[PDB]
Ligand binder design. Structure first.
Ligand SMILES: */C=C1/C=Cc2csc(SC)c2C1=O
Ligand SMILES: */C=C1/C=Cc2csc(SC)c2C1=O
Ligand SMILES: */C=C1\C=Cc2csc(SC)c2C1=O
Ligand SMILES: */C=C1\C=Cc2csc(SC)c2C1=O
Ligand SMILES: */C=C1\C=Cc2csc(SC)c2C1=O
Ligand SMILES: */C=C1\C=Cc2csc(SC)c2C1=O
Lengths: 261, 261
């Protein structure tokens, strides 16, 4: 055309940070379940969400990975499981990826472009719905930060429904107790490696499989890990860990154990 | 535009025949070696070629699979191994494939479009060279057709360099002898299941691994199989089998066994 320029809003991945994060995460990415969602936001942000039985898991890439040309970019959530490609996020963890951007060309779909040395491809996936808003905009009733050394001790101790783990929190003094069904309890009291910010005398029960998976997911950061028991409405357990590149968050509901039908 | 219509030359797959052939071939397709080539011809034709040590293997899809809009479509050969997708022909054997065509838009590349229910993608790969012409436009000095029952007997008998098999052909009367290094020979004389069209008293030696692989490849047709010993220049063994959808051809050179440096 001859007037003034115009390119559709474009959400681009910055390769060096993104490639660093997707390698660190390549364990989690290949294991992503068939119903996993990818969301692109003009914030900018990129969110992987997996909704399970009693667990919602979320992986948020932060701005350091993203460049957005134009903030009128409309939000898009697509299925990670893609009709011919399969695991889309896995595709992006290829080593010879050179360009990776998303364009807002239709309100109905999302145009993904990817490049490699002497090759380029694009596809569009239908936008799914949505809006699958499930966020931690609610503050904790008990909040505990665990040094990573503690995360590994927990993992190592849970080895190994197919079981539940009880979590007990004391207030005076503060302590946190992990109670398996077999009569073994693992406890942490105040010390340089576990910080109790807010705390009250309470207990919830979660599924052991999910909590273990949850802990594995946070441990990719090899950084501290945040444990919250939100008492909003649904009794909730929040486990999360983050670095400069991304944030692993997990929302586990208590297994209904208080009467009961 | 406002004048007369114009669409770039397009080589399209007819799904029902193509999907039938790619399923019948899904064993061979996934095993395709990293250096496998795909060629698109305005004939129309589609050719998969693999060049090995002493073996060139070729899979030709015939017209019943292809529709060509415009015969000015330029020939294109690309790598099957694709920078982000990996095995391209494997990708096309997906069950929810709904459209598969190739367009001549650049003399330098090939634009592949593929569709699935609510999804579509395209990519271009650089045209490689070429021209990798290796064809059977030379007639046999010995030519033997084997009933499929014979192909399976051969396969079953070769169980199981890492060995060679000698192939001996008699002329008066005609017979064909397969001689392993261990002193076991398998012979076929004239009967309703092996037809000797042209024949002379000669022997060549080929690598056992390749010949066995070659036989496996022809056997996907469960139809007769053509055995030729071309005496052009390079002493050559040709093994092939075809159906209405495609043609498996194999060119094996004799292992230099006649002095010798
Ligand atoms: C974690 C709990 C609180 C302390 C304590 C003393 S004895 C015993 S076993 C019922 C406990 C306990 O489980
Ligand atoms: C296939 C060959 C031709 C017939 C025959 C008779 S004895 C013997 S062993 C040297 C053969 C043979 O190998
Ligand atoms: C009318 C225009 C404005 C610039 C330009 C450069 S090449 C090309 S194609 C005819 C054009 C164009 O379309
Ligand atoms: C926490 C999530 C989960 C996916 C999704 C779809 S739209 C949107 S904006 C708040 C989100 C999100 O942030
Ligand atoms: C000038 C033309 C000729 C037909 C047509 C139908 S919709 C559309 S977009 C302005 C056109 C066009 O470009
Ligand atoms: C026998 C082959 C092998 C690949 C190729 C590239 S171009 C062309 S045309 C004769 C061929 C071919 O037919």
């Amino acid at each position: 055309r001859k007037d003034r320029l115009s390119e559709p809003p474009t959400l681009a991945l910055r390769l060096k940070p993104y490639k660093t994060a997707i390698q660190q995460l390549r364990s989690v990415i290949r294991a992503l379940k068939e119903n996993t969602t990818v969301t692109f936001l003009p914030t900018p942000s990129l969110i992987l969400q997996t909704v399970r039985s009693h667990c919602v898991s979320k992986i948020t890439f932060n701005s350091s990975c993203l460049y957005i040309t134009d903030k009128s970019f409309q939000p898009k959530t697509i299925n990670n499981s893609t009709p011919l490609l399969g695991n889309f996020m896995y595709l992006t963890s290829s080593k010879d990826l050179t360009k990776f951007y998303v364009q807002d060309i239709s309100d109905l779909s999302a145009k993904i472009s990817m490049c490699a040395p002497d090759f380029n491809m694009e596809f569009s996936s239908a936008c799914v719905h949505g809006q699958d808003i499930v966020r931690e905009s609610e503050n904790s009733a008990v909040h505990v930060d665990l040094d990573f050394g503690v995360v590994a001790d927990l993992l190592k101790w849970i080895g190994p429904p197919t079981g539940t783990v009880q979590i007990l929190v004391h207030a005076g003094p503060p302590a946190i107790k992990f109670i398996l069904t077999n009569g073994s309890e693992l406890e942490f009291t105040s010390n340089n490696r576990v910080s109790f910010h807010g705390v009250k005398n309470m207990r919830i029960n979660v599924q052991l499989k999910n909590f273990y998976q949850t802990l594995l997911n946070c441990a990719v950061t090899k950084l501290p890990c945040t444990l919250r028991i939100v008492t909003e409405h649904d009794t909730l357990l929040y486990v999360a860990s983050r670095n400069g590149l991304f944030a692993v968050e997990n929302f586990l509901t208590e297994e209904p154990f208080q009467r009961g039908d």
